[PDB]
Design a protein around this ligand. Sequence first.
Ligand SMILES: C=C(CC)C(=O)c1ccc(OCC(=O)O)c(Cl)c1Cl
Ligand SMILES: [Ca+2]
Ligand SMILES: [Cl-]
Lengths: 208, 210
Amino acid sequence: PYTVVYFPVRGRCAALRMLLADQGQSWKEEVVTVETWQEGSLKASCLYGQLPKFQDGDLTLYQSNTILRHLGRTLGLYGKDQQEAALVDMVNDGVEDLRCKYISLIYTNYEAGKDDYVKALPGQLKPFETLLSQNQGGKTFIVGDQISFADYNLLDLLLIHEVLAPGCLDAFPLLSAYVGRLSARPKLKAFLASPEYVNLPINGNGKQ
Amino acid sequence: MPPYTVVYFPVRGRCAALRMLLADQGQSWKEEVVTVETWQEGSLKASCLYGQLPKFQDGDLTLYQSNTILRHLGRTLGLYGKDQQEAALVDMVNDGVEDLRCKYISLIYTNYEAGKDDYVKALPGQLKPFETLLSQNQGGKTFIVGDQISFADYNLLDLLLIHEVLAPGCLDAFPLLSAYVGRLSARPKLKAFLASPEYVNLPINGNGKQ
Ligand SMILES: C=C(CC)C(=O)c1ccc(OCC(=O)O)c(Cl)c1Cl
Ligand SMILES: [Ca+2]
Ligand SMILES: [Cl-]
């Protein structure tokens, strides 16, 4: 255990938080405010001038996907073997691609871009439905028979997209059932219901 | 028959680093070349998981996403750190490389004329973290993480090479990055590959800009 240093928002920490909670891990949240970030000191000290910053004992990490991979590796949430690990990466990189588009919409082009984005969304989600359809008929996880860090990241992606574009999973039965199934995992369900999650905004600019 | 196949456009692009990796590791592979015309016809595109190349085959394992391919070769070829902590540092570097790569790609393909000057001026601030990493690892005399090569080295190396083409002398401010490029580039099999027609006669990008 484990310190997450981040703004008071869900953003790029939501998936790794869901992971730690569902895995019964303990961690410390160090919350960084607007004024503190503007002051410049903390920012200058971050490897790539960005949060999150993550501490695991004497190890300091940056990059949300690095933190996800590290937790995946250390907690056995990275597939059963190398072949599965590659598939886990393949899913997570696809989640990250759509997250980058989501982030660009939210922070740079929300008013003008939202219509085009929502129109494009079904074709962006379809690959994850297809992956589910090709793995145990979508009844288990995104890769293999055990949960991986990519499940937490995909789940987050789908949750924030349901806020953006209500009904966006209605055409996708496997993704729909997967969101319900994962969201019901007792520790995860508890975390999702908690004010620690519910009372943080998704993003830092009031848009969702 | 080689167990690896790379399916891609006739471009260095997101395949340069994984090819450098394969070549330097003495692994054999097939290049399947996809023309703009074929891509435009749409059926291969439709069959790709995320509608994009590269596509990579390792036996009957089919992968998409360049960093997925690098990580996979990283695992199977032992280029992913000596232990779990190193593996995370390797990821942290590679994600950093990827972030600057996206910025580079955005410049090249969407904003070359109007964005280049601003890009070149922001460049030192974007390269500095890699210098810092080098400086904190054996005085920058070996690799980007620990004392053995990783997939992040090949990705970083590619990123620095393409940046020297975009902005000649951009590593003059970064003695450790400069010496590192020289050192990695001189590895015998890599040096030979980098000099070869199969590398030299491909353009860096798909649109004629660099
Ligand atoms: C090198 C690449 C080929 C695999 C690549 O990443 C890439 C990314 C985005 C692109 O769209 C333009 C844009 O809006 O960025 C294009 Cl045209 C390419 Cl070639
Ligand atoms: Ca497990
Ligand atoms: Cl974010």
